[PDB]
Amino acid sequence: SLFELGKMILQETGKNPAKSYGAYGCNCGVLGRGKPKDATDRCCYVHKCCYKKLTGCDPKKDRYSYSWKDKTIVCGENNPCLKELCECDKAVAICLRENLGTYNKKYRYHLKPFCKKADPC
Amino acid sequence: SLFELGKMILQETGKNPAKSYGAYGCNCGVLGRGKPKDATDRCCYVHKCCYKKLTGCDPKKDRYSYSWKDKTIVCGENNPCLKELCECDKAVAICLRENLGTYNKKYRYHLKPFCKKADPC
Ligand SMILES: *CC(=O)c1ccc(Br)cc1
Ligand SMILES: *CC(=O)c1ccc(Br)cc1
Incomplete structure (x- = not known):
């Protein structure tokens, strides 16, 4: 969740x-996707x-269960959907950390209506 | 929407x-409800x-269509769900305006996990 x-x-x-990711750029936060503003x-x-x-499962x-082990997110339960969900979340958390270096406050509450339409996944 | x-x-x-309402208190923003922190x-x-x-309809x-007339939100289309939706949204916008006087920045990114369980509606 x-x-x-x-x-x-x-x-x-x-x-x-x-604060940092609840409304950032075209993809962090509510609704769907948009052409990304940055990493x-x-x-x-x-x-x-x-x-x-x-x-x-509803993302x-x-x-779902996960733990912090060796300063790593470790997804627990085997419920296939929840585990996939957990891994998606783990991945974005890692990714956001990896890209802190280019985090730009100007995108924090980026006007999502002006986002360009996202490509298919 | x-x-x-x-x-x-x-x-x-x-x-x-x-920024102001995307994560405020126990009810403004994502997921569901919680005992309200304030007005x-x-x-x-x-x-x-x-x-x-x-x-x-998905809120x-x-x-949905609405317009700003006489500095009032005026919900348009007759599609029953969309109109109800529009009115819900109009009401919260009005309500948030009416309660700006007690808006508290401390609740802006209130830790929603610690919210008390919401009563039934
Ligand atoms: C999925 C993801 O990275 C995201 C970020 C912010 C909010 Br809000 C919702 C989802
Ligand atoms: C419904 C409502 O007032 C609300 C406020 C903020 C976010 Br985010 C979602 C819904």
Whole structure:
């Protein structure tokens, strides 16, 4: 769920997830995708594409188990959808961390209506 | 959709919707409801309760027509769900404006996991 995702983002990036990523660029936050503004945004694009594989679980609402081991996100439960979900979330958290170097506050509450239409995943 | 909702919030409050309300308190923003932190939050609680009446339209994704007339949000189309949706959104925008006086930045990215469970609507 968004709870695990936010926690993962906090764990990897050390940033308040909602503040830093709740509305960033064309892909981080609500609704769907848009042409990415930058690498951080592209993380979120990839992450929304990743969500497309999920069957039977709701990426926003459904909790799943993961733990922090050796300062790594370690997805737990074998429930195929929840595990895929967990891995999507882990990946975006890692990706956002990796791209902190180009994080741009100007995209924080980027006007999503002006985003260019996303390519198919 | 969130586009119309955000626009309404901007029109009424003059605030960047994502920044001011995208994650505020226990009810403004993602997921569901929680015991409101304050009046602004309660607007959002009421607004998520309002969404519960919607059948056949997606409150996040579905566009609808409204206009700004006499500095009032005026919901257009007769499609029953979309009109209800529009009115829910109009109401929360008005409500958020009305409660700007107690808007508290401390709730902006309130830790939603610690929210108390919402009462039934
Ligand atoms: C999936 C992803 O990276 C994302 C980021 C922010 C919000 Br909000 C929702 C989803
Ligand atoms: C419904 C409502 O007031 C609300 C506010 C912020 C976000 Br984000 C979603 C919905």
